Structure 1
């Protein structure tokens, strides 16, 4: 067809933070479509990929991926907490990111 998307779009909002101290080890993700923790409970444990590009070709590609997963819900509005192998570079606040449907329970 014309669409081939097998993931859900999301936005990298910020790190986990207090009013004046942030914590880069936990990122905050807005998954689009979900507006409550009860709907966000479907997406727990799903893999997340941040997909970006670079000028230098490394192993056949100019596209590099950072992997992570959803761990828990955050707040009352469907924001989730996500942890990555290496933390997200904080210039990606507001950048798009992919939530895959695996590991599936359905």
Structure 2
């Protein structure tokens, strides 16, 4: 089944936050394989999605997606800042996100 997955695995770590104030509009995403802020420049502007399933079979489907884009790197270790169309729920801390390769400049 290794003829698929055009995307890259990622994890939703947290929102942008200070010690005591959280900003849910921007989320901190750890793209796996990206290990520094210079490698995070490749994934800037790429589409990222959160894919989950819900009980109702609305649209005749069991899966729904929240889309987003990668805006800028966060820190030195390769984490990025992502803004989603809808703010990611706080329950999705440590959940998985998919980073496509489009819009591609390669």
TM-score (norm 1): 0.97
Instruction: Find the aligned partners of 1:33 and 1:76 in 2 and give their Cα distance.
Output: 14
Q: What is the total number of aligned residue pairs between the two structures?
A: 106
Instruction: Find the aligned partners of 1:48 and 1:5 in 2 and give their Cα distance.
Output: 13
Unaligned runs of 5+ in 2: none
Deviations 1:40-87 (A, max 9, x none): 100000000100001101101010000000000000000000001100
Q: Aligned residue for 1:37?
A: 37
**Divergent runs of 4+, >2 A:** none
1:21 and 2:21 equivalent? yes
Query: Over aligned residue pairs, what C-alpha RMSD do you find?
Result: 0.8
TM-score (norm 2): 0.97
